[PDB]
């Protein structure tokens, strides 16, 4: 089926400290592979999946150094925004970023993402044409015009269409261990439970009160909902939907 990569980056400013806390978290087909964290001991892009270990110290200097840039970028930006909105001093603010790319089952580029939130509110976003911006509010217009009258979009486009695809095409080839080999739900009634599935997309029914899908810590997911009445399970990995009652 289809495939994706995403980096989630958060910077949080703090009263007193002149450097914000910074976390970046990498995801492949919706599953974590790399992470950086500013607070930590002495900080770098630790791997959070075993298949990423075959990348050699060399790849980590590259990425770890990249994360150094982003802190710089997020600090300055944190302070540009304070003025844009007349936020006075001593108060806690948050800037968030999302970027990455979708691939379809043929491995070609479906679409890129590059977007931003301030205080948890949409701020500015790259349109699906990788070439123009949607700005949420009047502050974001400043950013927009800076980014127009400076060609950022193409830079991101170049990362999105090229690099993003190239490396994901590769991570895929490096770790089908807990990726391409998807597993599927074991259901039962005690309310029917689906357990053990991957990916997390699933639907449940009763035929004659939704629990949200939830990590079980080991990489699989679970859901539930509560003779006539019978439960059906729908999933990416079922070679035919499941039907049951018992008890």
């Amino acid at each position: 089926g289809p495939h994706s990569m995403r980096y989630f980056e958060t910077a949080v400013s703090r009263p007193g400290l002149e450097e914000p806390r910074y976390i970046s978290v990498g995801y492949v087909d919706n599953k974590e592979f790399v992470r950086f964290d500013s607070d930590a001991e002495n900080p770098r892009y630790e791997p959070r999946a075993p298949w990423m270990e075959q990348e050699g110290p060399e790849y980590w200097e590259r990425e770890t150094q990249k994360a150094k840039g982003q802190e710089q970028w997020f600090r300055v930006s944190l302070r540009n925004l304070l003025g844009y909105y007349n936020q006075s001093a001593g108060g806690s603010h948050t800037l968030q970023q999302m970027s990455g790319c979708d691939l379809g089952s043929d491995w070609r580029l479906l679409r890129g993402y590059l977007q931003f939130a301030y205080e948890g509110r949409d701020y500015i976003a790259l349109n699906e044409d990788l070439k123009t911006w949607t700005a949420a509010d009047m502050a974001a217009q400043i950013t927009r015009r800076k980014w127009e009258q400076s060609g950022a979009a193409e830079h991101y486009k170049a990362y999105l269409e090229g690099e993003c695809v190239e490396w994901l095409h590769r991570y895929l080839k490096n770790g089908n261990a807990t990726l391409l080999r998807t597993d599927s739900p074991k259901a039962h009634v005690t309310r029917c439970w689906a357990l053990g599935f991957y990916p997390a997309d699933i639907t449940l029914t009763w035929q004659l009160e939704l629990v949200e899908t939830r990590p079980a810590g080991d990489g699989t997911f679970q859901k539930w909902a509560s003779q006539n009445y019978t439960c059906r399970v729908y999933h990416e990995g079922l070679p035919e939907p499941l039907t049951l009652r018992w008890e």
Binding site: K66, W73, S77, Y84, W147, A152, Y159, E163
Partner: peptide, 9 residues
């Protein structure tokens, strides 16, 4: 592989 930002907001 993460992306690098250029121009600030």
């Amino acid at each position: 592989a993460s992306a690098e930002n250029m121009e600030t907001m």
